[PDB]
Amino acid sequence: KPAPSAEHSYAEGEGLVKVFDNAPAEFTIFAVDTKGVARTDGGDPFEVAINGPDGLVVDAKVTDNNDGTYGVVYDAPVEGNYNVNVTLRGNPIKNMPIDVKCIEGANGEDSSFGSFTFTVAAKNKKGEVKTYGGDKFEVSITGPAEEITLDAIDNQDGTYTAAYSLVGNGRFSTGVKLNGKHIEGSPFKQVLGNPGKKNPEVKSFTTTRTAN
Amino acid sequence: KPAPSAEHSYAEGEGLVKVFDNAPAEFTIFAVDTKGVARTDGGDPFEVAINGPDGLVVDAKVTDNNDGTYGVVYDAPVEGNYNVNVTLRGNPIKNMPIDVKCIEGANGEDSSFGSFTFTVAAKNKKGEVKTYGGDKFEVSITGPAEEITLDAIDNQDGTYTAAYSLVGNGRFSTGVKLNGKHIEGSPFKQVLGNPGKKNPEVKSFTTTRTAN
């Protein structure tokens, strides 16, 4: 007997906040009654009109859960603004319509690692931190690098920086020394991709760079 | 018969260029005869006087090599200027005396890695590098950290950076996700120090950060 109310019904979900062009946008419609109490079951007529960039008309998929909740899923394939309007028998429900921003999404699986850094803090012979550079700083990356770039940098404030890029699959080990001695924790080992996928023709070799 | 000459004799070595306060300064005196020809044997009376900071008088250890060359080794324990003067009979040899700069040297073994970063370029569904951010970027570092700090940073230019500090002998696994999916190569193993000397009391735990 409790009938749905446009004024009280409302929608919530990420699909109404921020959307990406490469993944489905989802949100939920919560049917509420004239009185102001959540609806107990389904069958209420809610429609969803979504208009995207350059007159795109998006077809939202609405699923009646039979709880008084309606799950909405829709694709937004073109970066831009998407006006979403959930109506109940033609009347916009609470906080509708709503403009929803869609941005180019990152396809996670297509990203890879490559660039890395680390900083090193030098201490003097008494155990006090240094306040200037001038030490022989050596960084030597051993591994099956297809491609490798490495810079050993004296920052001139008692700290040193290694900045490097790696392309390849395998086990890498980076020896870091100050005036001929390994720092605590060195060598720092890192696995890039999967060792088993290493090109057979590419063996492990050392690349050494030094400051001062 | 060939006799050594102050005017032609000369010295060369890192101990005359840059000295560290925690490593012996070494150089060689090249006794050259009166005609301009290297001395063939030893026994010439070379004297080394080295004056350091705040009136310090340093004791050089001169070693006759018996081939016209004399190895000099001295300690310069306080940073500052060290005036070195190699003489032969009261006369300074060629290019003497010479002021030499002593700087505080890093004790590599008492130094450490201060921080680490890695950067990932996000790619859209077209396979091109994104030119802005907004993706959910999650970074988790799991292992027996004695100390750890971490941040997952959206650089707002299509790339994302994990920035962290780590103290602890161990194997660490780092999971990096962009919009809920591991990037190629994630999770990946890193090793700092030697996992075998892990204190059994230090439990392996996860630290997670998320941008957007």
- Residue-by-residue DSSP string for B120-178: EE-B-TTSSBPSS----EEEEEEE--SEEEEEEEE-SSSEEEEEEEEESSEEEEEEEEE
Q: How was this structure determined?
A: X-ray
Shortest distance between the Cα of B191 and any Cα of chain A, in A, equals 5
Give the number of domains in chain B: 2
Q: Do A42 and A57 share a structural domain?
A: yes
Tokens describing residue A151: 């810079």
Q: Do B106 and B123 share a structural domain?
A: no
> Which among A111, A128, A153 is the end of a domain?
A111
CB contact under 8 A, A110 and B184: yes
Residues in CB range of B159: below 8 A, 6 or more apart: B119, B120, B121, B122
Q: Which domain holds residue A178?
A: 112-212
CB contact under 8 A, A107 and B120: no
> Which among A111, A133, A151 is the end of a domain?
A111
Best of B103, B111, B131, B161 to disrupt the A interface by mutation (most A CBs within 10 Å)? Answer: B111
B113, B117, B123: residue with CB nearest A185: B113
Whether cis (ω within 30° of 0) applies to the bond prior to A187 is yes
- Measured between CA atoms, the residue of chain A closest to residue B166 is A185
> Which among B54, B85, B111 is the end of a domain?
B111
CB contact under 8 A, A189 and B190: yes
Resolution value, angstrom units:
2.2
CA distances from B196 to A141, A177, A188, B110, B168 (A): 22, 22, 15, 20, 11
Q: Do A117 and A90 share a structural domain?
A: no
Residues in CB range of A183: below 8 A, 6 or more apart: A120, A176, A177, B108, B109, B111, B112, B113
Interface of A with B in 182-201 (CB under 8 A): 182-186, 188-194
Q: Do A8 and A76 share a structural domain?
A: yes
Q: Do A104 and A14 share a structural domain?
A: yes
On whether the CB atoms of residues B152 and B137 are closer than 8 A, the answer is: yes
